[PDB]
Amino acid sequence: SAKDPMRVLKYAILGLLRKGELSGYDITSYFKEELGQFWSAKHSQIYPELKKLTDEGFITFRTKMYTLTDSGKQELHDWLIRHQPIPETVKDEFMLKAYFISSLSRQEASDLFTDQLLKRKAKLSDLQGSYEKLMASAEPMSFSSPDFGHYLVLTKALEREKNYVSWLESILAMIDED
Amino acid sequence: SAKDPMRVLKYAILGLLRKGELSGYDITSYFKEELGQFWSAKHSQIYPELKKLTDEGFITFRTKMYTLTDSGKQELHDWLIRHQPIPETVKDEFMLKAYFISSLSRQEASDLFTDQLLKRKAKLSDLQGSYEKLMASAEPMSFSSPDFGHYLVLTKALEREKNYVSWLESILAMIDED
């Protein structure tokens, strides 16, 4: 039997509650801000999933402020420590174009890759802004910082985008070979 | 109205035919080998999609060996040169775990990240093998090489995995701070 796509939000919700109670507004806000950037939700799915997790006994609410139950804390813990295989490569449509580059002239290839580069540099600039905002905190960064998780997400994103930009630069130099 | 998920294979099929005729066996083989690694197909979808593209006049066959029509070549061209926005970040379940790292002890965090590192180093080794196979060709690599597209896919993958490994190493050193 088919499963509900909204179940993808489960660990994102349980994890959001790991440090204490949040309102539904607080949860939705985390999705619309930091989490939505790497773990997006369809706004329509968040409350339905919250309800499922409540009904399953993973979360409780009072007056609503939601919190993890002992069961929910265990559910989050077991997922965190589980070793999964690494997932299959995510489809990158630009890379499919790159695979078929023989269908483009040198100039068309240069134009395609230049467009991709400018866009990714602009995205990098945005990530750099988010990273500077986080690092504007007083507490220096370390494993023990309450913001370490957020630091992990942002540094991962920054390194990914920097690496993409560097690869594009290298390919543009090949397209523009001496 | 909902669209057919198999349509995701369209440009992969048209592009595979850009250099001349292929059998259905040849196409399926490309999916099961080099393409399937970054542009996977459900084996069940390839022939149905080939049929749709034939019926739409993008591809023709003779006796079957498939080839692009003028329409198909234009369809591929227009897609290649189109500038699209960069897509949203693909969900990386490990990174959601990283975001919630405050729920793990230092040792549990180290164990989680070590597992991910060993797995990604092993994947890197596999990509390195594929890259050496490609580079075992006589023709040196350049924009004009018929294998340039394949080189682009493999180098992109290698750089991505190397960057992931480097980031994991950095985080493990933070978890194991002096």
Side-chain angles (χ1 to χ4, degrees), chain A residues 1-31 34-87 89 91-178, chain B residues 1-31 34-87 89 91-178:
Chain A
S1 296
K3 301 174 191 171
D4 198 317
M6 82 183 50
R7 73 193 187 283
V8 78
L9 299 182
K10 170 171 176 181
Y11 296 100
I13 291 166
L14 298 177
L16 279 175
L17 301 171
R18 76 199 182 291
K19 277 183 185 262
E21 73 181 2
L22 291 181
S23 61
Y25 176 89
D26 292 325
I27 293 165
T28 297
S29 295
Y30 276 108
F31 278 106
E34 33 189 279
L35 199 57
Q37 298 293 292
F38 71 99
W39 205 270
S40 59
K42 306 189 190 183
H43 172 269
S44 63
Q45 290 174 321
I46 293 162
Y47 290 131
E49 180 66 5
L50 244 179
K51 169 181 170 55
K52 289 181 177 173
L53 299 174
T54 303
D55 293 347
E56 289 164 24
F58 296 129
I59 296 176
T60 200
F61 68 78
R62 47 85 156 173
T63 307
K64 308 153 82 173
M65 301 293 290
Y66 300 88
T67 52
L68 291 174
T69 63
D70 289 340
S71 187
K73 285 177 195 181
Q74 192 68 49
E75 193 73 357
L76 175 67
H77 179 78
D78 288 348
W79 168 78
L80 285 164
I81 69 163
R82 192 152 72 236
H83 297 162
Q84 304 277 208
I86 61 185
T89 297
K91 282 172 168 65
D92 182 335
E93 197 163 354
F94 177 82
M95 292 308 304
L96 191 70
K97 294 185 185 194
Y99 186 65
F100 296 136
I101 196 167
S102 64
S103 286
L104 297 182
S105 68
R106 190 183 296 275
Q107 186 63 53
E108 290 170 326
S110 186
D111 289 352
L112 174 63
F113 274 69
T114 298
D115 175 73
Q116 186 76 188
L117 173 81
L118 292 188
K119 284 165 174 158
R120 291 207 178 257
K121 283 178 122 163
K123 179 175 177 206
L124 185 52
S125 188
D126 293 347
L127 286 166
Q128 184 62 31
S130 299
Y131 173 86
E132 292 168 358
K133 177 163 177 293
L134 175 62
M135 302 302 270
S137 176
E139 171 153 2
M141 184 55 61
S142 75
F143 175 75
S144 298
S145 173
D147 295 330
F148 193 56
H150 195 178
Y151 175 88
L152 295 183
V153 165
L154 286 172
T155 61
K156 178 74 182 64
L158 284 163
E159 279 294 304
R160 173 178 63 248
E161 294 298 322
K162 291 175 182 176
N163 181 259
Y164 211 132
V165 164
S166 292
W167 181 86
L168 290 164
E169 288 178 342
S170 293
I171 301 312
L172 280 162
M174 296 185 79
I175 292 168
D176 191 28
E177 64 184 300
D178 285 358
Chain B
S1 296
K3 301 174 191 171
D4 198 317
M6 82 183 50
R7 73 193 187 283
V8 78
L9 299 182
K10 170 171 176 181
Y11 296 100
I13 291 166
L14 298 177
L16 279 175
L17 301 171
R18 76 199 182 291
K19 277 183 185 262
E21 73 181 2
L22 291 181
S23 61
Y25 176 89
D26 292 325
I27 293 165
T28 297
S29 295
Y30 276 108
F31 278 106
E34 33 189 279
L35 199 57
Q37 298 293 292
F38 71 99
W39 205 270
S40 59
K42 306 189 190 183
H43 172 269
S44 63
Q45 290 174 321
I46 293 162
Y47 290 131
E49 180 66 5
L50 244 179
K51 169 181 170 55
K52 289 181 177 173
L53 299 174
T54 303
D55 293 347
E56 289 164 24
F58 296 129
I59 296 176
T60 200
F61 68 78
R62 47 85 156 173
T63 307
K64 308 153 82 173
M65 301 293 290
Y66 300 88
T67 52
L68 291 174
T69 63
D70 289 340
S71 187
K73 285 177 195 181
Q74 192 68 49
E75 193 73 357
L76 175 67
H77 179 78
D78 288 348
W79 168 78
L80 285 164
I81 69 163
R82 192 152 72 236
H83 297 162
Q84 304 277 208
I86 61 185
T89 297
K91 282 172 168 65
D92 182 335
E93 197 163 354
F94 177 82
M95 292 308 304
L96 191 70
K97 294 185 185 194
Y99 186 65
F100 296 136
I101 196 167
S102 64
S103 286
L104 297 182
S105 68
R106 190 183 296 275
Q107 186 63 53
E108 290 170 326
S110 186
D111 289 352
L112 174 63
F113 274 69
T114 298
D115 175 73
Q116 186 76 188
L117 173 81
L118 292 188
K119 284 165 174 158
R120 291 207 178 257
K121 283 178 122 163
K123 179 175 177 206
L124 185 52
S125 188
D126 293 347
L127 286 166
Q128 184 62 31
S130 299
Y131 173 86
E132 292 168 358
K133 177 163 177 293
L134 175 62
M135 302 302 270
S137 176
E139 171 153 2
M141 184 55 61
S142 75
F143 175 75
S144 298
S145 173
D147 295 330
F148 193 56
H150 195 178
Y151 175 88
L152 295 183
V153 165
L154 286 172
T155 61
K156 178 74 182 64
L158 284 163
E159 279 294 304
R160 173 178 63 248
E161 294 298 322
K162 291 175 182 176
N163 181 259
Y164 211 132
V165 164
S166 292
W167 181 86
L168 290 164
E169 288 178 342
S170 293
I171 301 312
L172 280 162
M174 296 185 79
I175 292 168
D176 191 28
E177 64 184 300
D178 285 358

